[model samples]
Target chain A: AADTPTACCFSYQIPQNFIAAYFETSSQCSKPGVIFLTKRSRQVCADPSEEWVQKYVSDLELS
Target chain B: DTPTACCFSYTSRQIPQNFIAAYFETSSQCSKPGVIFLTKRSRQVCADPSEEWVQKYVSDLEL
Candidate 1:
């Protein structure tokens, strides 16, 4: 369902080899966070507060 | 160091108050302080935190 709420991310550690990323869309989520897609095709839920996290996000917008 | 979603730029255009499904603040890692508003379309828009209209919108959401 498109109306369904998105999931929340709680881990704040820096992830490695992320291939893509997106943000959580639902207010129903306990907290908002950035989701990173890794080279292994894994989804990493990361805290947006990290410096390295935002830098990766900035780069993705151009691609 | 992989790509993820982060607000690199901000828009002066504002969304209807009702259109905002959720929001999150950009951390110090971002180029500037901003409010990332999630719209009904599940799109994300970056807004200046100092803007009066943005301030009002955020305050209302807090309540």
Candidate 2:
């Protein structure tokens, strides 16, 4: 892949714009990551940069 | 209200993504259809659909 996005649970980058997505602390998702996510869709904890740990995180705030 | 990561301005599309400077619906711009963008450093309107000039944008390299 020419470019890869931030690797968080709900994180995915938009092909055209690199709009990085991640499992926000929002209540919409469940423990693993998804609200109803089961073993088939399990989740876990992950490490994040200070800027990324809590709040809107871009792939990398700095170039 | 704008995202904080978008202060420096962005010229390179391949950089940390287009560094969201501004996003507005086409209806807000030229009364067009989709969406439009303006990266902080992108002197010209980023994605204005109205064709003052339009193209794929990045494929012009001489590879």
Candidate 3:
């Protein structure tokens, strides 16, 4: 897709068992990690570098 | 004051959406504002409302 630049945080999915999320922005904030939601409906940001993020987390692109 | 435990989901022109992550306690799901993220992770649910490390979503409703 021309609009979706791979350089950006391109979304993705997994085999339904593992997680299908990640971060890929060149910017800071330690983003490009997990993109979970909070109790308040806020988007949470975790450092993908974290060991756990690499464990339960997976997939940055769908097709 | 203490915040409540809740869950939330959002949509945008950017990404379709995925996370049906947990949040804090609120009056209701559709009536008032939604919960916010505690950090970059959802596993770390925010229990104390005054928790500095975590914060709720400043929903457009602004309860």
Candidate 4:
């Protein structure tokens, strides 16, 4: 018998209310971490460094 | 006349914020819907849903 592996990616949008709640609950100036969607699977990471934050914010604004 | 309301409750513990950070750092993954980070000490599950995912959930469920 042979083992086969398959990968899939999932994407989902975030909610503004959730973001507000997270900030309120955590009381952190920066936003909470997010899980990004990809071709293989959803990936979770701590809010990236400040450098990434700027890029992310810019991307969100464009979209 | 009579009226009734419904609600439910469970006894799950909340995960610590530090654990969340450690999980992300160690796992090096992004956040995803329906996925939770568990704290080893307290054995609590932290439901860190992304903002975008929450928005989609609310919209889909019409909440």
Candidate 5:
């Protein structure tokens, strides 16, 4: 018999400020984690660094 | 407070002949008026009454 894999899913809301800048730059902000669809497991990066933070938050809020 | 004037880019073909009118609102339905002016060169230009423009107009109108 072969081992069968299962799927998994997760969801999180990004901060409003970050969401704004992401949209302005047309950047992707899916968070720093991976959700395995087959095994239903999640693997988050050891450090979700601030470098990933966007440059403009006000533009988003205003838009 | 006065509204400001700003320009956004669009294709020359997207603009219609003759002056066009457009409107925007807060999704809550507060309407704002806008106008499109097409140039002979096939460029589409948009102009509107803005809070920022009112200040500029007042100063420039005097000159």
Candidate 6:
């Protein structure tokens, strides 16, 4: 509840330097999404299905 | 896109029409009844549901 992601129906390419990512499940969002927080403090919505997205999320979780 | 969560704060200021890409009403379960506007920048701007501009945006964006 501390932080929540904006619902995402569309997706964009992975950002160059995202600090973190949150998964928005299809049940909670219009579409399954990965909300990435960039170094500039911008939030971008991306499709969770993308390989790069999966890799990014996996990397973040390892930390 | 839908509202990721409820709005704890609300604003009445009108945002540029082009700035908004999507929005969704918060659930009655939330403490406040509001509209969460999804801007093109992917920011979540919360507005009073009773605000005239809010209703206008909802009407215009309605499918």
lDDT per residue, candidate 6, B1-63, as tens digits?
222465656764688988899998976655557688888888788888888988999999985
Candidate 1: TM-score of chain A is 0.67
What is candidate 3's TM-score against the reference? 0.23
lDDT of 6 by residue, A1-63 (tens): 212233434435655465554555445344466677777666676767788878888788886
Residue B13's C-alpha lDDT in candidate 2? 40
lDDT against the true structure, per candidate, is 0.63, 0.29, 0.33, 0.29, 0.28, 0.67
Candidate 1 residue spans exceeding 4 A from truth: A1-36, A39-63, B1-5
Backbone clash count for every predicted candidate, in the order shown: 0, 6, 18, 16, 12, 0
The lDDT leader among the candidates is 6
Give the docking tier of candidate 1: incorrect
Model 3 chain A lDDT-worst window of ten: A1-10
lDDT of 3 by residue, A13-37 (tens): 2133333434433442112535544
> What DockQ does each candidate score versus the true complex, computed on alpha carbons?
0.03, 0.02, 0.03, 0.02, 0.01, 0.09
Better of 2 and 3 by TM-score: 3
> Residue pairs in steric clash, candidate 2?
A11-A21, A30-A34, A30-A35, A32-A43, B9-B41, B10-B41
TM-scores of all models?
0.49, 0.20, 0.23, 0.23, 0.18, 0.48
Candidate with the greatest DockQ versus the true structure: 6
Tens digits of per-residue lDDT for model 4 on A1-25?
0111111212113322222211111
- In angstroms, give how far residue A34 of model 6 lies from its true place: 20
Model 5 achieves a DockQ score of 0.01
Please report, as a residue range, the 10-residue window in candidate 4 chain A with the lowest summed lDDT.
Answer: A1-10
lDDT per residue as tens, model 4, B35-61: 223344534232333445423433443
